[PDB]
Structure formats: structure tokens, C-alpha cells
Amino acid sequence: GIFPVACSDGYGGLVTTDPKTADPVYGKVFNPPRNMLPGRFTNLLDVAEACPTFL
Amino acid sequence: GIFPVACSDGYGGLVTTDPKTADPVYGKVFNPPRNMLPGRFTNLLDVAEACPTFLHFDGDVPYVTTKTDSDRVLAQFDLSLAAKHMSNTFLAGLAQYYTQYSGTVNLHFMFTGPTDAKARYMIAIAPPGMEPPKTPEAAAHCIHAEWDTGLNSKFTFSIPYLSAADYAYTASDAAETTNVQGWVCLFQITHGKAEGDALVVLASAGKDFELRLPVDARQ
Amino acid sequence: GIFPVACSDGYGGLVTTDPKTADPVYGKVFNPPRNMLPGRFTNLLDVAEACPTFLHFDGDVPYVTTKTDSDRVLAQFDLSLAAKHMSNTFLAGLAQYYTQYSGTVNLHFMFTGPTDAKARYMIAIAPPGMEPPKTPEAAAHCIHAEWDTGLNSKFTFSIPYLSAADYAYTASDAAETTNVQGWVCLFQITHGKAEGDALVVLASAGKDFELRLPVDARQ
Amino acid sequence: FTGPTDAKARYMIAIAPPGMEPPKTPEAAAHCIHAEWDTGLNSKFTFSIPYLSAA
Amino acid sequence: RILTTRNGHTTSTTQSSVGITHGYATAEDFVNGPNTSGLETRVVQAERFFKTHLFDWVTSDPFGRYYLLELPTDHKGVYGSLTDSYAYMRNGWDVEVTAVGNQFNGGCLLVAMVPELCSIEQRELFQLTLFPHQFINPRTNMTAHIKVPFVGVNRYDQYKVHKPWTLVVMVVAPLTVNTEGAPQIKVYANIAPTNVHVAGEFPSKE
Amino acid sequence: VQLQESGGGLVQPGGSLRLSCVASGTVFSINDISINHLGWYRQAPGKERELVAAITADGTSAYEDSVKGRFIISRDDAKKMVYLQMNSLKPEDTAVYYCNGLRASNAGWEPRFGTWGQGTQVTVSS
Amino acid sequence: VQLQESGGGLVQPGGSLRLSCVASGTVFSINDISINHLGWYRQAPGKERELVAAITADGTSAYEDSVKGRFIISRDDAKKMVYLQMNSLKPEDTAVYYCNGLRASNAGWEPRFGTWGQGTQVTVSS
Amino acid sequence: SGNTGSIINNYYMQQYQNSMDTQLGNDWFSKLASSAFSGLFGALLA
Amino acid sequence: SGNTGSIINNYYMQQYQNSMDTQLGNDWFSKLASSAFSGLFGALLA
Amino acid sequence: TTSTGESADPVTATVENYGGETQVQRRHHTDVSFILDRFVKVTPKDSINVLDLMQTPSHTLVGALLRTATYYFADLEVAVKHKGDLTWVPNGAPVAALDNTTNPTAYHKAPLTRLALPYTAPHRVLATVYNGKCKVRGDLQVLAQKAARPLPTSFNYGAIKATRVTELLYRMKRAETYCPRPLLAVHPSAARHKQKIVAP
Amino acid sequence: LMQTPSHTLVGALLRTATYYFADLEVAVKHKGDLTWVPNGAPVAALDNTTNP
């Protein structure tokens, strides 16, 4: 006997904003170094506080 | 009740390079012993460093004879693994299955003529952006080396890897304009009574040569 | 949310020799006691070593009578589990369900005639690559043994396993040319007043006989 | 060896024990006791004929 | 640069030598296996030199001319009788190639030991430096030396149906005489089996 | 690597021509594409060969204002062919046409980007 | 293990014959195949039986230059039969034909590889 | 120890998958084949 | 260590998935490429 | 860097000879085990196929990179698209066994069926090239030698049979390779042979 | 990544940066079989099956 499972109805469709990942195809790739490049921003609400614009 | 699961859409197809295995059919098979057989290799870039191969010059010969005239250029070609002068080496044959590379390429020169023939040569590299030099005087302003014949009949020179990007392409058989990676030029400075004598030349990988991104173009 | 899973393509079919089980239907059944019944066997290659069986010679008889003439060959046959002389033993019957083998094969000889008949025999093996010997003088240069009748009426000789590969085939009923594993030859050196007396011969497995890769050819 | 500096050569010496006619070609004499040398900076060679017999 | 080799009761001395090339291994692997049942044996009377003629190097041969020599060849000594007395053998090789012309010649040769060579292509000649090899340049040296072990898909072999090695000599630059060199050059070889083993005696001749 | 053409020869002025570009196949290399910019050149006897038209990657078309409005050009990439339509025939058409590609520099289109072509000539004189 | 043939007997010269190989079935053993190389042999009265043709595993066919160009051979493995076509009938055809297999050695093809055949004879004399 | 090669425990209890043996209170051939005489019988020279 | 990247143990025993190697009692190129001579040969000035 | 040419010893010259700098290397993509682990298409036959690794075309990635080794070893995986039921048979077995069901048979399940087979040959290692053949009658000798220089017959992984076979792909696992051989690229006719890279 | 329309949410928010870096995921609805090819490879390789 093998572990019995129950496929469910209404689950598993595609949603364009779900929190889950895909399956890898191409492995062992290394990137060129990009650390400490000038002028980074992480939150789009910090350039809105550091830089005003005209009316 | 049993453990409920949710089959997902877009997952589970067949991909020809995925990292997963199949199901066994036939079990308990033992192999004949094959340990320590002579002549193993694990990385295909170690036989490219331990064993160089010949170049190809006009006439279907892997060498260049000394000229007795006012023109002093022996051979000049673009720097690319797809060049015509490199079409018979092990380096180009292997590189045709990858898309990008980086690092050093070595060249070996060996002199053949008799004991009473002497010569003197020079090799330079011209980076891209300006037409390459035709005369040794003009090429004296690039990166160059210069040697001559003696008791040790071999020389070795490393073409530096110099570019803007971190990697460079191995593809694009040009048959066109727009060189990208530069030229290399072999010159003959002077010679004494060495008419008709040959200088064979080989090619091999360097200390930090690297090759990435495999592909299949059916060559 | 429930645990998401990804059904895979190419997996899960039925295979008639897979290592997995089925689902139970009927439960709580107890068996009558059967412990320590006489005459058990676990490996089918132990009754092949504990119990030899008869050979088959021309005339539907498992023996060979002494000849009174100038020809001294008693029996000669190829070394193969598919040979005709081995078609009735337990070894060939079992080996017809496998593809490869390796190891030793034993042969047993027993003398029958009266107390006042004496004889002397010899057995050799000829490896492949040269036609087998016809005379005892010529066969004296192979691997051979030689015995004679007495109070102990039985002899045992082990055909060595000698080849290039590590395993050898049990298949290929030849009815053709191209022997692969060699011949074995039984000779009669001399004899005293033993006309018409028989020598029966049996066959069995050896210490290190082995059999691998089961198959089903419907024999 | 005596000749000039631009002449080179290569020699071989063998011994044939009694009981069979001696060899005529170097290929055939390669199966006896032999030595083989050539010219260079040291222009001399020395070889010892072994003493081999029944008595 | 003197070097002296010795195999059995034979020797050989050269004065212009650039070393020995050990190709594909420096030692021999397991000789006793489960396929011979422990019946093998060694023959030390079979390890010594023998000579042969290869070809004549004329000034009119272009690049790419080759000469093939299959090992083991027709021999008459004790080794040539081993192949008539037994059914399975194995042994490594030791080769030496010599081309004698004065130091006023030009050109280059390339000797190499190739496992299982069968009609190499024309373009594949540019890559013959993957196998154990050595050059012969009259300006510098006159001799080549190589050493190879036993390779094969089997631990013992039948030399009447399979020849696992091949000695090939190619021309990379033609010969030049320059009115001071020898008009032509003859190439000879010198070969000795190492680590022989045998099993499976045969019946007599007839 | 070298483009062939067909549909030329000796022709009388006033007909209707469709020059055809029998390409060698355009073995052209790596996925860096969308620089596919072909064109047509004419050549005069002893006078430098001049451009006629040029086609951009998708839809733009320019012509020499000598022939502007008279010719029609279009490419068919699904089968990888390009053609040249010839209507409103004038005496000015006597030139050898080369089906080739363009460079698209800042100042103007530059030539091949190739080895050379063969060409087809359409000389009309009444 | 022993191949039968049919289609022979007494026949007049100038007809059209297709000799047929009624094989016993070719029980032939292990998956080591693609050495399937059959052939045909002729036999003369008191003179050693000579080859005629031989078929390789897939497509190659050779004949004795006495009959070269005149005969056509082909095998049908899907049903496992092989045949012999006989056109351009000469007086030279008087021989007994054996449908058998070949050995393909280094020097030349060697014979069976079998027990023996029966044969069919085609003697034509006008 | 038949032809089974999974490494994860069975899902069902052993009571439902198979039948249970009881006790009361081949395999003779493996003892018999081990008792075979190997050495030589007579006096050995050479 | 081929092209395989799962982190959960295999389901089947190692005896059924692959064939088992035995012992008796390339890879020469990685020793050979490491023994290459790098430095300069003659006397160095400047 | 000067040295003796004939000696055949390896020698490498770095960029520190004229003042340069030597950088870091990552060579994961050229390992034999890695690069040879991927599927490769093969032209199949209708009923019976003999699984032999020399049927991959010599121009594909796996085909040529395999053919630059003289001896090799690997397990095998196949992916078959068929109709009916599929039966596998080990090395060196009679051809009648292709009809019996007790041999490993995979019942049809769409779209395809992926299996894993062991290494079942009697030799310790396989070979890509073999020197056994020891090498008017014009065409006779041509087609005699042409068929007298193949490999031996025990260099295979078994056989498969089905009512019809439509696709068949090979994948090698645990690859090991010995004694390298030549590997050549397409010879340009002009000054360079250029692929048309991805570009509009 | 410059083929997303400039008016969508991702398109414009991406276009307010001069330099960027990211991995990629695609979701394709097709007929037949789908072959991917890395950066800078010949256009003939789109026909070979050994590529993913």
C-alpha cells in the first residue's frame, strides 16, 4: 500500500499574484559582481521624501 | 479523512534538463571492477591546458616561413575563437558548444631551421577602436614581447583578457566588418641566412580561462 | 490553504517488476503452524551443488564403454551450458532462465566393470583459438589430469573458468561454427581385459559458480 | 670515432654462441647479447665479451 | 645529455636525449583478476629489444604524411612464440625512434602512441598532440622515448583478433639539406615489451 | 553569406518588373536581431554606386527623392524574402540593383556587412 | 536452422524468374544482430560452388562481375524473407542456387554459419 | 526480504497487509552443501 | 554529483536505483595540468 | 618564457610575466558528469530497437562530446512514446524473449514513459572505437570492409520492442571517460564562420 | 523586459529606474514543444531539442 491522498476541488488554479515559485531548468549560474553601486533605493516612498517636485 | 492535497496548474511537465530521476525496474546488479584504469579525465578544460594543438595558415600548413623582402608581417588575424586560423584546434572545437568565455589564451612558437640560421621575432596585441599596425615600429607602442633563436627553441606568450564587460562571446562568424575584441600581429624583425625555414605555432588555454552557458547549434 | 503538490508526467505507470506493494482488503487472518518441516531450500544454487545429474551420450545412455581399437577418443564436446551432452542435467535446465554466468563446473566419473578389469583415463581442456587435440600425446600439453581404477571408484575434476571478459553467455545454441569457450576431451590411455565395461559421468556446479540477469524465453 | 664534427653515425656489436651460423643483418643479431651506441662528445665506447662455455 | 637504457641482457646508449615521456600512467595496475582463476604467470625471458625499419624521410614529403605500425607485429624470438603457445596475454610497451642526420638539417617530426587508431581523418592530424608524443628536431636532438601501459576493455587480450596500440610518425615540416646536411634520412625503431603475462596453454602443434 | 537576385536581363521600357532577392538563406548569427535592415543600391557606369531605398526592421521605408513616390518596397520575413516593385518606368532606371543590408549609423546608413553581391541589371532605352 | 527454397525446376531460357527463399524461420539467437548478411551461391557440376551475390544488413549489394548489372537482389525483413530476381537470361544460369548467410571477414565473405541447404536448380539450354 | 526496495515504512499495519504466522512448541540443502569434502584423499607428493 | 539538485532523500534504496560498484585489491590529466612550469627561465633584469 | 620544445612537457605562461594580474576561475560547466546529463533525440525504428550509445548523431552536443573519449561507463535512462506495451530485455538475451510479458513491461499511460536501466554488459568498460578488423572486386571489397569495420556486438544496454515507437531519448548518469581523442569544429570558408545571434 | 507596455503597473514602475537586476519567470500557452535558449546564442539552436 502507498500513502493515500485526496485531490480537492476548487484548489490549484493559476493566480497572477500568488506567493509560490516555479521549477528550475538551468543550474549553476554565477553572476558578475555588482556590490556597492552608487545610487540605490529600496522603498519608492523615500525618493518622494528626499526630492520634491514643482506644482 | 485522508490528507488533502491540491494539484497545481502549470507544474509537472517534462523538461529535458530538469534535476530529477526516474523509477527503478531491475534491481541488485553488480558491476565488474574498473578501479584505477590508466588515463582518466574529469574536466574537459584540463586536456585543453595539458595538450596544445596546431594553428592553420594559408596553404594548409601549421607554420610560417621567413620572407626575404621589405614586407615584415608574417601573420595577422582577429582575436576570436571563431577565427579561421583557429578552426582546427581543440579550443575552438570545444568552445563551439558554449556561448561565453573569459580569460587567457596561450601561444607557443618553435623554431626549426639549421644550426647556422638565426632570426628574431616580435608579437603584439592591438585593442579595438583603431586599425591594426602594419610595421614593427608602429606596433612597438602596444603590449608586445620580442625573442630570438638560441639553445631553447620555444617561446610562450599570453594574450591578455581586456574588455569592458566581464564576459565575451564565442559566436558570430563575422565574414563582415566591426571587429570587437581586437587583433594580434606576428612580425619578423630581422634574420641571418634563414631563407625558407619554418616556425610552427600552437595554441592552448591559460591559467584562468573559463567557459559558461552550454548550447547546441548542431556543429 | 492546503499543501500544494505537482503531478508529474512520465511517472506512475504499471511495471511488472517494480518494488512496491498493493492495498489490503481482508484483515486479521492467522495461518496454521508450519515451522520446521523437513526438506527446505532457499537458494536454487544449493541443490545444484548438493545433487549432480547424469550426462547424455550417443545412444540415449549416460555412460561410455571402453573401445578395443586404435582410436582412443571416448567423448569430446564444446564447453557450454547449451551443449547437447548437457541437455538433461539440472544445471542447463536452470541456466536457461539467465543470460550470463561465471565460475567452475565439476564432473564426476565412476567405474563399473568387474573386479578383474582395469583401465586408465585422462581428461584435458583446450582453450579457444586452435582446433582441439585428437590424440593423448597431443593433449598432454594442455591442462589435464589422469587417474585409474582401484578401490576408490570415483574421480572429480574442475573445468577452470578462463576467459578475457568477466562473465560469459549461457545462450546461443550454435548448430554452426565459431566456438567461443573451448572444448573438453576425454581419452582412454590403456586398459586390461575391460571390453564392454561402462564409465558413468555426472555434472554439478562448483564452489564459485554464479548466475545473473534473469530472463524469460519460454523454454 | 675520428671523422669531423658534422659527421654522425650509429653502431652495434653482438656475440653469437656456437652451434648456429652467425647473423648477417642487424635485425637478426638483435636477438643475441648486444650493445648499441652513437657518436657525440665522448668519442669512445667499451664492451666486454662474456666468457660463456661448458668447460 | 647522456642516457642509458637496459632491458634484459641488451643495452642502448644515446648522447642527445631530452628525457622519457610516461604516457597515461607511471605504474601497472592489478594483474590478478577474477577472470583467469589464478592461472597466469610471468615470463621474464621475453622482455628485450628488437629492431625494424620505418621509412625514408626525403625532402619532397609535404606536411601530413604519416606511417602506421601496429603493435605487436610479426616477431621471431621467444615473444613471437608466446603468441603460439598461449591464448591470453597482456603487456606494456617501450618505444624508441631514431633519425640520424647531421646538425645542419631542417625540419621536424612527431612520433606518438595512439590507442586503437583506425584511419584518422585529414583535419584530425592537426590535433595529434593529445596522445603521448615527442618531437625530433635535427637542430637539437635525434631520439624519442615513450612508455605506455596496457589499456583495453578487457584485462587479458587475444592478440590474433585485436591490436590495442599503434605507433604513428608524422611530418610537420619538410626536410632541407642546405648543401651542408645529409641528402636524406632513414628512420628506425627499437621496441621492448614490459610486464608480460600469459595464461591458457594450447595443445601441441599437430 | 552572399545574396543572389533574379528577374533582370534585357527588358523594354514601359513594362512591369518585380525584382526578386534570392538570398543565400541568411545564416545570420546570434539572437541579437531586430537590426534586420535590408536595402537596395543602384550602380552607374564608372560613377559611384548610389543608394535607392532602405527598409527598417518593421515598417519604415525611405527612398532617394529622385525616385520617391514611384517605387514600392516590402519584405516577407515569414519566408525570409524581400522584393522590389518597379512601376512608372523612366529612362533613369538603367542601373544594376544590389539586394543587401544596411548599418543604420547616426549620420546615415552604411553598407555591408557582407562580402559583396552579384547583381541584376535593368537597362531600358527607347 | 535449415533454409528451404522454391520456384525452380525445369524452365526454358528467356522467361522471367523470381527465386524465393522459404526460410525455416530464422530462430537465430541473441539481440546481437545487425550482422544479418544473407547471400546466394551457385554450384557447377563437379566444379566448386561459387558465390553470386551478397546483401549487407541494410543496403549494400555486390555481385560477381560475370553477372554484374544483370540481377537484382533485395530483402524484406518486416516479414523476414529474401528473394532473387532473374532477368536478362543467358546460357550461364545453369546452376543450383543456395539461399544462405555470410560471414563478412576482412578478406572476403565466408560461408555458413549453418548446417547446409537443399537448393533449387535452374538449368536452361536451347 | 523479497523483491521490495522502498525505504519509508508501510502505511498499513502488518496485521492487514499480510497474514500472521503462528508457532508450535529447503534449508537442509544449505547445511548439506556446506559439508562437502574438498581436500585430496591420498598421500600428496610434488 | 551530476546534474541533480533535490534536497530530500531518494525514495528507493540505493540498491535498486543504480548498479553497485565493486573493488579489486582521465584523472591523470588533472595531475598533469598541475605540474606545468610557470616561472621565467633565464636571469631576470628590470 | 623559453624552454625546450621536443621535451613534450607542459608549460604555461601567466600574465605576470609583463606586469599583469591573475584572476579567479570557476569551471563547473565543463565537468564530464554535469555536461553529459541531458536528453538527446534518436531516430527510432518501428518494432525493435537496440539501445546502443553510438546511435546519437555525431553533430549533437552529447554525441560529439561522448565521441572524444575512447572508453566510458554510464547507467541509462530512456523516455519512450509508444502504443501498446513496452518490454525491455537485458544484454545478450534471445530475441524470442521480446514477446514474453514477465520481462519488465510498462503498460501504456499517456503521454510518455520514463525508465531507469542499469549497466548490464559483461566487460568492465565500453569503447567508442575498436581496432579489431586489423586495418574485379571493386565494389565487393568496398562493401565488405565497410561492414567489416563496425564495433563488437556486446556493446549495448539491451533492447526494447513495442507495437510502434514514435520517440526515443537517451540520458547518461554517473558518466566517466578515459583517454581523450580529437574534437573538431566547422571549418569556415571565409575569414570567420558566424552564427546569426539573437538580433532583429 | 522593455516589451511590457509603459502604462501598466509593472511597466512604468520599472521605467522609473535607470539600472536594474532581476531573475525571470515566464508563463506560456502554446502548441507543440517550447525551447529556451540562453543569451547570445545562434538562432539555429532554436530547432535543437537538447536545449531545455
Author numbering:
A (entry chain 3): 1 to 55
B (entry chain 3), C (entry chain 3): 1 to 219
D (entry chain 3): 111 to 165
E (entry chain 2): 13 to 218
F (entry chain A), G (entry chain A): 5 to 130
H (entry chain 4), I (entry chain 4): 15 to 39, 65 to 85
J (entry chain 1): 1 to 135, 144 to 208
K (entry chain 1): 53 to 104
In the authors' words:
M8 binds to the FMDV viral surface within the pentameric building blocks surrounding the fivefold axis at a position akin to the “canyon” in enteroviruses. M8 recognizes a conformational epitope constructed by VP1 EF, VP1 GH and VP3 GH loops within a protomer. All three complementary determining regions (CDR): CDR1 (residues 32–39), CDR2 (residues 60) and CDR3 (residues 110–119) and framework region (FR, residues 66–70) of M8 are involved in extensive binding contacts with VP1 and VP3, burying ~1,100 Å2 of surface area by pinching the helix of VP1 GH loop in the “up” conformation between the CDR2 and CDR3. The epitope recognized by M8 primarily locates in the VP1 EF loop (A93, P94, V95 and L98), VP1 GH loop (K133, N143, V144, D147, L148, Q149, L151, A152, Q153, T161, N164 and A167), and the VP3 GH loop (A171, S172, A175, E176 and T177). Notably, ~70% of the binding interface between M8 and VP1 GH loop is made up by conserved residues among serotypes. Interestingly, VP3 GH, rather than other loops, adopts an alternative configuration upon M8 binding, whilst the binding of M170 does not mediate any notable conformational change although the NAb does target VP3 GH loop as well. Overall, out of the 21 residues in the M8 epitope, 15 (~72%) are identical among these four serotypes, which explains the cross-reactivity and comparable binding affinities. Notably, the structural overlay analysis reveals that M8 competes with β6 subunit for binding to the RGD motif in a similar interaction mode and M170 partially occupies the αv subunit binding site on the virus, where an N-linked sugar from the αv is oriented. Perhaps correlated with the inability of simultaneous binding, the cocktail of M8 and M170 did not exhibit synergistic neutralization activity (down). Interestingly, results of a fluorescence-based assay revealed that M8, rather than M170, destabilized FMDV particles by 3–8 °C in an incubation time dependent manner at physiological conditions (pH 7.5), indicating that physical destabilization of viral particles that interferes with normal uncoating may be a possible neutralization mechanism for M8. In contrast to M170, M8 shows indistinguishable binding activities against 146S and 12S since its epitope is located beyond this region.
The causative agent, FMD virus (FMDV) is a small non-enveloped RNA virus, belonging to the Aphthoviruses genus within Picornaviridae family. By using phage display immune libraries derived from four llamas, we previously identified 24 single-domain antibodies capable of neutralizing FMDV type O in vitro. To define the key epitopes and atomic determinants of the interactions between FMDV and its two NAbs precisely, we determined the cryo-EM structures of FMDV type O in complex with M8 or M170. Icosahedral reconstructions of FMDV-M8 and FMDV-M170 complexes were achieved at resolutions of 3.2 Å and 3.1 Å, respectively.
